[PDB]
């Protein structure tokens, strides 16, 4: 509610830190065809924009002439755009990992040259002898790993959009 | 400080939620020997203890009859014990993941039933000629990823214990 607008800036700041954390966790160079939620570097600038728009609400929370509320509305519009962008991005990336990918989304050099040999989207060995092979127990683990990361990110994107929608009045 | 202690319960609640999320992410069946941070099932009861010691702080912020402050003490001390236990487990698990694990910690059956064979500590083939294999680019990548998750969990645990030690005064 608006009466407790003080305790939504700590929330926004922690949310920005959590976006920073998920971005840092995504930068790990595991394969050449990297997820689309990393090569676009969304979580970094999204978290930093949340952190500015939160820290600015944090320590003023009062009625000033123009900058305060004008910034507050442009930042809230920016945040809602960022939220719908993250929604669309997650709903495309879940499909990218659980259903055959369609967009290559080429990646950066400094991270390709480390692990340029492996595929993750469809790593099923051709010869049936490798059905009980490390490369597929490994692939099933890594698929579960993206599923867990993306499900937590999904849950938190809905929580942010929920409390934003509950504080836009 | 006390001047704004009424907005620390939200920090406690969110930090408990972060502990729950990291525990859920560690639940994934990655290898035969799961880390000690998940075999002891710490993060679950840790997050629940955090959430409960939170949702009592932000109740009324007044001097209740007897229930709020006596429990704010007993529940506070128990959370201190939990925090120092988490410290000890983390300083054990860093050595476990970056030095050869001296203790077993056999994982549970309903999860290993999918990937029961791979090891996460020593992915070194006997013959050095085979060292140019996918299963070790993979194991080094997983080791760096576990290192990153545990490092961010260490960071956030020091942050939560610092804010606690600051406010519980």
């Amino acid at each position, epitope marked *: 509610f608006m009466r407790e607008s003080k305790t939504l800036g700590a929330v926004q700041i922690m949310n920005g830190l959590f976006h920073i954390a998920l971005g840092g966790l995504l930068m790990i160079p595991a394969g050449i065809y990297a997820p689309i939620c990393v090569t676009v570097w969304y979580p970094l600038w999204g978290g930093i924009m949340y952190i500015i728009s939160g820290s600015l609400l944090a320590a003023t929370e009062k009625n000033s002439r123009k900058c305060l509320v004008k910034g507050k509305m442009i930042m809230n519009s920016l945040s809602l755009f960022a939220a719908i962008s993250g929604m669309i991005l997650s709903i495309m990336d879940i499909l990218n990992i659980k259903i055959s990918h369609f967009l290559k989304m080429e990646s950066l050099n400094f991270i390709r040259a480390h692990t340029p040999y492996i595929n993750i989207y469809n790593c099923e060995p*051709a*010869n*049936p002898s490798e059905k*009980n092979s*490390p*490369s597929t127990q490994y692939c099933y683990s890594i698929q579960s790993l993206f599923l867990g990361i993306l499900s937590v990110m999904l849950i938190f994107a809905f929580f942010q959009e929920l409390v934003i929608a509950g504080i836009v009045e | 400080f006390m001047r704004e202690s009424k907005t620390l319960g939200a920090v406690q609640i969110m930090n408990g939620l972060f502990h729950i999320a990291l525990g859920g992410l560690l639940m994934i069946p990655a290898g035969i020997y799961a880390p000690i941070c998940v075999t002891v099932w710490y993060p679950l009861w840790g997050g629940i203890m955090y959430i409960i010691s939170g949702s009592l702080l932000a109740a009324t912020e007044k001097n209740s009859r007897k229930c709020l402050v006596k429990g704010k003490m007993i529940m506070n001390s128990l959370s201190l014990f939990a925090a120092i236990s988490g410290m000890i487990l983390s300083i054990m698990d860093i050595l476990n993941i970056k030095i050869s694990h001296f203790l077993k910690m056999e994982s549970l059956n309903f999860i290993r039933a999918h990937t029961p*064979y791979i090891n996460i500590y020593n992915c070194e083939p006997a013959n050095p000629s085979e060292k140019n294999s996918p299963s070790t680019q993979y194991c080094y990548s997983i080791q760096s990823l576990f290192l990153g998750i545990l490092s961010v969990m260490l960071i956030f645990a020091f942050f939560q214990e610092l804010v606690i030690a600051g406010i519980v005064e």
Partner: antibody
Amino acid sequence: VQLVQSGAEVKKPGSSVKVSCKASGYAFSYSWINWVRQAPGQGLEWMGRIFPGDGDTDYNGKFKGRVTITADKSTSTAYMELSSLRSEDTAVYYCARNVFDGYWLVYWGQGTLVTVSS
Amino acid sequence: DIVMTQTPLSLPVTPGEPASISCRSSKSLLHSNGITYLYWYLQKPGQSPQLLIYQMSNLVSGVPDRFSGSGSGTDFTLKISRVEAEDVGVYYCAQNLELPYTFGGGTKVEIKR
């Protein structure tokens, strides 16, 4: 690495043999186990395979499931059984360990020649 | 079943100059991954088979470098840079793209005199 196979046995049609393809020097449970025979006048023909870890199998299909494959984890010994022997089953039977990641079948046993005759 | 056919079944070779043996597949082995999976086995007289050429383009540790292989996807050639008097035996090609695995009929290489 060593793979030591059972000795040679001469039998009669309708009998059965149990060959022990015992090996040491590696993780037996971390490798596949296959049996392959070599009959005179024919090339090499795959008859089946076993995964000792959990009992997974693959069959060629030409031999309609008549073979029984088992595993003994207590001694890391695999066994091959051949019933209803026919003259066309005379061959040398080899066991072989699958090595993952490209090097399919580097180490092979010495083989056991089984001759079926009345 | 997929049938493997070799040509020729036997080839007397003379030291030095010639080296020629071919395999072909009836289904045009290709997994759309850019690599064609193959194996070459050698059975020396009186002992167990050994692998000479793995994935058709790489050699194993310890085998003399005088061995090579190439192809397009349906027609294949195994080349020996310098044939000697010790690489006797039956050479087998094989495919592992799909179950069931199949093996060639064998080519007996001998010395020409």
